[PDB]
Design an enzyme around this catalytic site. Structure first.
Site, PDB file in Angstrom:
ATOM      1  N   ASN A  81      11.356 -13.929 -13.360  1.00  0.00           N
ATOM      2  CA  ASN A  81      11.435 -13.255 -14.660  1.00  0.00           C
ATOM      3  C   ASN A  81      10.592 -14.019 -15.684  1.00  0.00           C
ATOM      4  O   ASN A  81       9.599 -13.579 -16.251  1.00  0.00           O
ATOM      5  CB  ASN A  81      12.916 -13.315 -15.074  1.00  0.00           C
ATOM      6  CG  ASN A  81      13.235 -12.191 -16.053  1.00  0.00           C
ATOM      7  OD1 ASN A  81      13.990 -11.314 -15.569  1.00  0.00           O
ATOM      8  ND2 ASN A  81      12.625 -12.330 -17.239  1.00  0.00           N
TER       9      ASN A  81
ATOM     10  N   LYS B 260     -13.909  -6.806  15.083  1.00  0.00           N
ATOM     11  CA  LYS B 260     -14.375  -5.840  14.055  1.00  0.00           C
ATOM     12  C   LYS B 260     -14.856  -4.640  14.898  1.00  0.00           C
ATOM     13  O   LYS B 260     -15.138  -4.796  16.118  1.00  0.00           O
ATOM     14  CB  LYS B 260     -15.391  -6.496  13.161  1.00  0.00           C
ATOM     15  CG  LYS B 260     -14.946  -7.687  12.319  1.00  0.00           C
ATOM     16  CD  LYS B 260     -13.747  -7.417  11.390  1.00  0.00           C
ATOM     17  CE  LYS B 260     -13.989  -8.065  10.025  1.00  0.00           C
ATOM     18  NZ  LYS B 260     -12.817  -8.775   9.510  1.00  0.00           N
TER      19      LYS B 260
ATOM     20  N   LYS C  63     -12.932  -3.416  11.525  1.00  0.00           N
ATOM     21  CA  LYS C  63     -11.586  -3.630  11.004  1.00  0.00           C
ATOM     22  C   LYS C  63     -10.680  -2.675  11.774  1.00  0.00           C
ATOM     23  O   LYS C  63      -9.720  -3.154  12.384  1.00  0.00           O
ATOM     24  CB  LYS C  63     -11.536  -3.472   9.486  1.00  0.00           C
ATOM     25  CG  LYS C  63     -10.078  -3.505   8.990  1.00  0.00           C
ATOM     26  CD  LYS C  63      -9.940  -3.882   7.532  1.00  0.00           C
ATOM     27  CE  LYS C  63     -10.070  -5.366   7.282  1.00  0.00           C
ATOM     28  NZ  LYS C  63     -11.488  -5.737   7.009  1.00  0.00           N
TER      29      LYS C  63
ATOM     30  N   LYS D 102      -7.911 -12.891  16.794  1.00  0.00           N
ATOM     31  CA  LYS D 102      -6.712 -12.378  16.045  1.00  0.00           C
ATOM     32  C   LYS D 102      -6.952 -10.893  15.770  1.00  0.00           C
ATOM     33  O   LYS D 102      -8.120 -10.460  15.617  1.00  0.00           O
ATOM     34  CB  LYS D 102      -6.450 -13.116  14.726  1.00  0.00           C
ATOM     35  CG  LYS D 102      -7.559 -12.937  13.683  1.00  0.00           C
ATOM     36  CD  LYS D 102      -7.328 -13.519  12.303  1.00  0.00           C
ATOM     37  CE  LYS D 102      -6.099 -12.989  11.539  1.00  0.00           C
ATOM     38  NZ  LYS D 102      -6.454 -11.666  10.904  1.00  0.00           N
TER      39      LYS D 102
ATOM     40  N   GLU E 109      -6.013  -7.731   9.997  1.00  0.00           N
ATOM     41  CA  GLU E 109      -4.768  -7.551   9.230  1.00  0.00           C
ATOM     42  C   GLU E 109      -4.092  -6.186   9.378  1.00  0.00           C
ATOM     43  O   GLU E 109      -2.889  -6.153   9.636  1.00  0.00           O
ATOM     44  CB  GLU E 109      -4.930  -7.856   7.740  1.00  0.00           C
ATOM     45  CG  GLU E 109      -6.256  -7.892   7.073  1.00  0.00           C
ATOM     46  CD  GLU E 109      -6.880  -6.653   6.505  1.00  0.00           C
ATOM     47  OE1 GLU E 109      -6.561  -5.466   6.420  1.00  0.00           O
ATOM     48  OE2 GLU E 109      -8.010  -7.030   6.026  1.00  0.00           O
TER      49      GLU E 109
ATOM     50  N   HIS F 256      -0.967 -14.931   7.635  1.00  0.00           N
ATOM     51  CA  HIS F 256      -2.116 -14.274   7.028  1.00  0.00           C
ATOM     52  C   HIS F 256      -1.817 -14.039   5.536  1.00  0.00           C
ATOM     53  O   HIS F 256      -0.710 -13.571   5.204  1.00  0.00           O
ATOM     54  CB  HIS F 256      -2.537 -12.891   7.618  1.00  0.00           C
ATOM     55  CG  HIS F 256      -3.945 -12.690   7.098  1.00  0.00           C
ATOM     56  ND1 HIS F 256      -4.919 -13.658   7.252  1.00  0.00           N
ATOM     57  CD2 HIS F 256      -4.517 -11.687   6.387  1.00  0.00           C
ATOM     58  CE1 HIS F 256      -6.048 -13.251   6.674  1.00  0.00           C
ATOM     59  NE2 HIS F 256      -5.825 -12.053   6.129  1.00  0.00           N
ATOM     60  N   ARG F 257      -2.735 -14.347   4.655  1.00  0.00           N
ATOM     61  CA  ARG F 257      -2.479 -14.160   3.218  1.00  0.00           C
ATOM     62  C   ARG F 257      -2.992 -12.854   2.608  1.00  0.00           C
ATOM     63  O   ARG F 257      -3.079 -12.783   1.335  1.00  0.00           O
ATOM     64  CB  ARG F 257      -3.240 -15.369   2.608  1.00  0.00           C
ATOM     65  CG  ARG F 257      -2.381 -16.611   2.609  1.00  0.00           C
ATOM     66  CD  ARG F 257      -3.187 -17.787   2.331  1.00  0.00           C
ATOM     67  NE  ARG F 257      -4.243 -17.827   1.328  1.00  0.00           N
ATOM     68  CZ  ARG F 257      -3.931 -18.455   0.176  1.00  0.00           C
ATOM     69  NH1 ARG F 257      -2.699 -18.964   0.070  1.00  0.00           N
ATOM     70  NH2 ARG F 257      -4.782 -18.558  -0.825  1.00  0.00           N
TER      71      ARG F 257
ATOM     72  N   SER G 182     -12.120 -19.717   7.788  1.00  0.00           N
ATOM     73  CA  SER G 182     -12.839 -18.458   8.145  1.00  0.00           C
ATOM     74  C   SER G 182     -14.182 -18.580   7.449  1.00  0.00           C
ATOM     75  O   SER G 182     -14.464 -19.675   6.925  1.00  0.00           O
ATOM     76  CB  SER G 182     -12.049 -17.209   7.816  1.00  0.00           C
ATOM     77  OG  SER G 182     -11.833 -17.228   6.406  1.00  0.00           O
TER      78      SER G 182
END
Lengths: 436, 433
Positions: B99, B154, B156, B179, B182, B275-276, B344
């Site tokens: 908050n 890729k 993606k 990997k 995402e 993963h961010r 990366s």
């Protein structure tokens, strides 16, 4: 990499809509110092879809001047559950707000609106219950049941179990609903188990003394879903006969979408109170990245929140988008095909005297009010303060002039005087009309 | 709020740490026009606590010229589980960051660092496993096992199950780890159940053909924890004998803390790849709100991520050392396991050594794009040149010397001449061609 591949400016948004095979998103994006707008818009599309039409995301409109970019996303791009076929907001976010919030040729990008077609929308959980669940407990009509008067217990943290339960018991003498403050849970000085047992008892006492049903919104936020479930189960069992008078509060912003879905699917018969804590960093208008409050709240409905804090552009626009079957957003008109409404939860405070003006503007009073204790200011005390809000709602609802309702209702009457200055402006001749 | 109650500038940070009963946070805070700095910080501590170690949060240091506010939070304020007594990041975020950020007298507040005393740190999950689990699988020493070479498939999204599994196969001839991107999961044109079955087989083939162990990081992200668990169980099951070779990818940003904890506690034996995706909305340095990437990664270690995309050597140290220095606080981790940095970008074989030299080790996972994809001989050659550049650095052998005996690496110079020109002047005559 394909300012021709990922861009189709001759597409008719109407066409896209009618088609029903694309999620549309409108963004306020600005390209870094130098890079072409359309090329960059191309770059954002590609980056938000296919690495390196049909499965490709397309830029269908741009307004260089307005820093406006609108992109169509084939619905086939969105992930869905292997378990039950349903959609997931996580995926929606990844695709339309993920790594695209980190590009290099883009200064900022913020989502202002989105459109989800029938096919996609229908795969979402949606609200299981809303304020109508609460209306029912209150003995109100399930259609246009009106105002639910609530508060937040203060201090934020500090109260021991007994002191906390007594403060609950005391507000329930005048009001309907109380919610835990954001942080309240299992602190060593106020264990959840102990506190909750005492709150349940305070609920019984205020119900017996008042002859009215009371409601509590209990914080069950945790990192571990099994912790969320154990909190929820402990709360409902403890409340016992009063289990339907309990709402489950989850801060979906700090604990994320999985916290929300845990409560939604595990306790679908209890109102799921979606609290927004610190979503400030993104939704705040000084922020150019992320998405707006509008977008946040619209997402909440698809997620299944029963109500969400929305606050006292336009929140009226938010309120409509959350409750109507057909609503207009800043950019897209959305049909909900029967998805249950998500109730606006408003905060702050307006004395009983201003209250009516708010309902007029909104057009209904079907909201949950979680008012600072100041909105409960009254020369006779906070019981009288909360009563006056209820009385102001009742006048408004009945179409009875307030000055007249006051004559037969002490607390509303007494409120006029509590804020004689406000009355003056608003209702000149009140005193006249009252005696005072 | 109460400028006299929530303010104790006589408190010594040193005493605070030694006491071990306060969480300390350091913020970059500016009060809106016309409010006094101390006043505003006092209101900020108030709205963050009870709105020393009473229960009130106290401002113990202020520097108005530097826009610095440091607050001491009694550990008693933090929520903990009724089920097992452990801490939760959800409470840390609400208190020190909820908050309390959409205020009035306060214009912006960004948390730059935090200190967790021992008693509180010990109640966090922490990583269960890190890169040393990957090393063990690769037949590398479990201490300084070195570089793990991977990529992202890729495009993606778009590839059908078979085409996807073969692209995997192809890269595995040269690299170690792959990997999912995402968003790849259960799209209708590439169903998770079908895709994963084909990928597990591509792993068996790649392994038989190379005589080397291969790793896969599979996206298990979902809103429903029961779906997360289902995805994870299906993946482990399908990999069969290769279950130990799977990392579980979870975007903890879009799905949040509970998605991370779901994976951490349900599959403690598999590497939890955090993963961010999207964090950039708050942690980026344009946002004068929320918290920094440093803070984000620091929390990730407490939550239990095995590895986290870090995209400095400060974040790297905080993530891996038992004792590290942050921007304001020195933190001890008490034996809590390291969280591995996942790098990366366009790190090619030529830049690798300088990078290892700076970092001081090669104990990372590289999810390479055009360091690999950008080699003149294709990605397999690119992958091999990265491994060669690590072996050269590991061994203490000069890369030109190494490059003379290793064609991939040698061919990497031709592939990145600007890099070669600028890092290894005299390379052309040296490799002689």
């Amino acid at each position: 990499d394909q300012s021709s591949r990922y861009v189709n400016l001759a597409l008719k948004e109407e066409d896209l809509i009618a088609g029903g095979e694309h999620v549309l998103c409108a963004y306020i994006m600005k390209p870094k110092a130098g890079y072409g707008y359309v090329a960059t818009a191309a770059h954002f599309a590609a980056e938000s879809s296919t690495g390196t039409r049909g499965v490709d995301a397309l830029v269908y409109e741009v307004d260089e001047a307005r820093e406006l970019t609108k992109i169509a996303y084939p619905v086939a791009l969105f992930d869905r559950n292997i378990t039950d076929g349903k959609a997931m907001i996580a995926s929606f976010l990844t695709l339309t707000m993920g790594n695209n919030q980190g590009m290099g040729d883009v200064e900022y990008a913020k989502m202002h609106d989105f459109y989800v077609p029938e096919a996609y929308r229908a795969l979402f959980d949606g609200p299981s219950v809303n304020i109508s669940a609460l209306w029912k407990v209150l003995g109100r009509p399930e259609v246009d049941g009106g105002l639910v008067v609530g508060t937040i217990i203060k201090p934020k943290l500090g109260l021991r179990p007994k002191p906390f339960a007594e403060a609950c018991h005391a507000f329930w003498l005048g009001g309907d609903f109380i919610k835990n403050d954001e942080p309240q849970g299992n602190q060593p000085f106020a264990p959840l188990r102990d506190t909750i047992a005492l709150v349940a008892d305070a609920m019984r006492r205020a119900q017996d003394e008042t002859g009215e049903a009371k409601l509590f919104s209990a914080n069950i936020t945790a990192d571990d879903p099994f912790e969320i479930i154990a909190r929820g189960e402990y709360v409902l069992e403890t409340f016992g006969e009063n289990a339907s008078h309990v709402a489950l509060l989850v801060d979906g912003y700090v604990a994320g979408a999985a916290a929300i879905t845990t409560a939604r699917r595990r306790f679908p018969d209890n109102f799921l109170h979606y609290h927004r804590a610190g979503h400030g960093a993104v939704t705040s208008p000084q922020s150019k990245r992320g998405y707006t409050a509008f977008v946040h709240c619209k997402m909440a409905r698809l997620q299944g929140a029963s109500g969400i804090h929305t606050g006292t552009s336009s929140d009226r626009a938010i309120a409509y988008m959350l409750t109507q079957d057909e609503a207009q957003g800043p950019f897209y008109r959305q049909s909900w095909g029967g998805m249950k409404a998500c109730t606006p939860i408003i905060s702050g405070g307006m004395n009983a005297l201003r209250m009516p003006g708010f309902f007029e503007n909104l057009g209904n009073a079907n909201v949950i009010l979680t008012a600072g204790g100041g909105a409960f200011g009254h020369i006779d005390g906070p019981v009288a303060g909360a009563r006056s809000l209820r009385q102001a709602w009742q006048a408004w609802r009945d179409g009875v002039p307030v000055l007249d309702y006051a004559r037969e209702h002490k607390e509303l009457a007494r409120a006029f005087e509590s804020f004689p200055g406000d009355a003056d402006q608003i209702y000149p001749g009140w005193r006249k009309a009252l005696g005072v």
